[PDB]
């Protein structure tokens, strides 16, 4: 079921690693700066995601941080199947970067802006994700 | 009221956990943070505000709220300033499964939000989708 499908990618800025989870059906994003592109940090990020939204499947790039035990254990535990927006996000980060000392803050401002922007009766990604999930429950 | 959250701190193993509760549903977001400072508090609120439509946050109005940083983040995000025992129980039930407290906290949030005739996670999206 497509309300439950997410795509996870990494992106890199200032020598730091940003994980970006996109809810495929809405375009809603969750992203954060993480210390290193490791299985442990990747598993943590997914555990957090899975507690907030009803995550069924997460499509990943299948690289090094996914070959070990830790992401597999977290996805097993949480019941997750492992079966342009990077550029968009970076564009927004660049507009706000001088407003924050730390990149991590700029990233969360950029998530805010991405999720809440109304491009029109046209909804934001934040509104789209809730409407899609609410529809699937009732 | 769909936009109202409550933010409280709780302490375990010498670490600080911030807990945001969506008052109308009981849905929670929580994380271990390095220190109960304005800067870490503001970061947490900025993250929350990007994920949900946050209009009002009720806080304990303590030391981490007197400075410039939380005020600057809430201004920016358009937030007006105006469960711990449950979470800690769940944390204790899963703690031996994780080396690090932070992981146990996120397993506990998962359990809290998904336990079920709706779960808190279902209740929050229904409330917000009704308001839109």
């Amino acid at each position: 079921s497509s309300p439950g499908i997410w795509q996870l990618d990494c992106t890199h800025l200032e020598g730091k690693v940003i994980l970006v989870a996109v809810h495929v059906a809405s375009g809603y994003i969750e992203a954060e700066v993480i210390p290193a592109e490791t299985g442990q940090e990747t598993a943590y990020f997914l555990l957090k995601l899975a507690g907030r939204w009803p995550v069924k499947t997460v499509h990943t790039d299948n690289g090094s941080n996914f070959t070990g035990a830790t992401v597999r254990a977290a996805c097993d535990w949480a019941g997750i199947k492992q079966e342009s927006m990077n550029k968009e996000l970076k564009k927004i980060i660049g507009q706000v970067r001088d407003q924050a000392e730390h990149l991590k803050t700029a990233v969360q401002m950029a998530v805010f802006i991405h999720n809440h922007k109304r491009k029109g009766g046209g909804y934001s990604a934040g509104e789209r994700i809730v409407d899609i999930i609410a529809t699937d429950i009732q | 009221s769909p936009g109202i959250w409550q933010l409280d701190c709780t302490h375990l193993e010498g670490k600080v956990i911030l807990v945001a509760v969506h008052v109308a549903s009981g849905y929670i977001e929580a994380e271990v943070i390095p220190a109960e400072t304005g800067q870490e508090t503001a970061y947490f609120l900025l993250k929350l505000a990007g994920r949900w439509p946050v209009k009002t946050v009720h806080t304990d109005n303590g030391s981490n709220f007197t400075g410039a940083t939380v005020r600057a983040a809430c201004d920016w995000a358009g937030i007006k300033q105006e469960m711990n025992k449950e979470l800690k129980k769940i944390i204790g039930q899963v703690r031996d499964q994780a080396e690090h407290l932070k992981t146990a906290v996120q397993m506990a949030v998962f359990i809290h939000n998904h336990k079920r005739g709706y779960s808190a996670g279902e209740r929050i999206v229904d409330i917000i989708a009704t308001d839109i």
């Binding site: 001088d98 407003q99 924050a100 000392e101 730390h102 803050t105 401002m109 | 800067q39 503001a42 970061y43 410039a68 940083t69 600057a72 983040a73 920016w76």
Partner: peptide, 6 residues
Amino acid sequence: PKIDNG
């Protein structure tokens, strides 16, 4: 000076 700080 910036959002997350002075």
